[PDB]
Amino acid sequence: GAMSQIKLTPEELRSSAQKYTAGSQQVTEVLNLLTQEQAVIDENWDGSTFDSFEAQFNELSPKITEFAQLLEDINQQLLKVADIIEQTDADIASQISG
Amino acid sequence: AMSQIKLTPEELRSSAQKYTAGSQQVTEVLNLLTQEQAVIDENWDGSTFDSFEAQFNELSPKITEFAQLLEDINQQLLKVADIIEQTDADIASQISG
């Protein structure tokens, strides 16, 4: 099971996790910023010139939100797994006598 | 249809900069974490992480498309700013001359 299958240490799992949460946050910020820019362009440039970019942005936008959410979910899984593994090491050290 | 475009060339260019910067940032995150997904895959035997792998893989091409869209918007904003800037110059010269 996992104790056999996982080769990353708790520390390695935590270092990987940090990359995912930082990327989640960065993606969210980009999307939030450019959502505002899209609205500014829409309001301050009358007509249909950017209608196709508007539709494409709006179609992709929820995928970007999902991606940010996925990256954060992965951070949480890796942190939780790291804690379970670290406690396993401690429990073997305390409970096993060999 | 009004002809008026309320954003000035300078304003259009400031917005374009945000699109291309955002594009780069999204691509960097996808690059870094594509590589980290392969680390996890190689260092976690079996199928336990398979769903997170599938979820990442399904979204990845959309992320690449998004980053390209952002670059495309940048490019067209710069093009429109240049058209407007010439027009502004031609009107200013016409009125002053």
Residue numbers in the entry:
A (entry chain C): 0 to 97
B (entry chain E): 1 to 97
The authors write:
The sagEsxA-like proteins form a homodimer and the structure of the sagEsxA shows that the driving force for the interdimer interactions is principally hydrophobic in nature. At the inter-dimeric interface, hydrophobic residues are prevalent in sagEsxA-like proteins although there is a pair of hydrophilic residues Y18 and Q36 within the hydrophobic core of sagEsxA. The side chains of these residues form hydrogen bonds within the hydrophobic core of the four-helix-bundle complex (inset) and the presence of these hydrogen bond pairs between Y18 and Q36 is indicative of the anti-parallel homodimer arrangement found in the sagEsxA subfamily of WXG100 proteins. As a result, this conserved pair of mutations can be seen as a fingerprint of anti-parallel homodimeric WXG100 proteins. In addition, it contains a 310-helix with hydrogen bonds originating only from main chain atoms, whereas, the loop of sagEsxA (residues 43–48) consists only of a single tight β-turn. The CFP-10 subfamily is structurally more closely related to the sagEsxA than to the ESAT-6 subfamily. This is reflected by a root mean square deviation (r.m.s.d) of 2.07 Å for a superimposition of the core residues of CFP-10 (residues 11–83) and sagEsxA (residues 11–83), compared to an r.m.s.d. of 3.43 Å for the equivalent ESAT-6/sagEsxA superimposition. Secondly, by examining every WXG100 gene in its genetic context we could clearly show that all WXG100 genes from the Actinobacteria phylum are encoded in a bi-cistronic operon containing a CFP-10-like gene followed by an ESAT-6-like gene without exception, whereas, all the sagEsxA-like genes occur as mono-cistronic genes in the bacterial genomes belonging to Firmicutes. Interestingly, the sagEsxA FRET signal could only be detected after extensive heat treatment. This result shows that the homodimer is stable, and a FRET pair homodimer can only be reconstituted after heat dissociation.
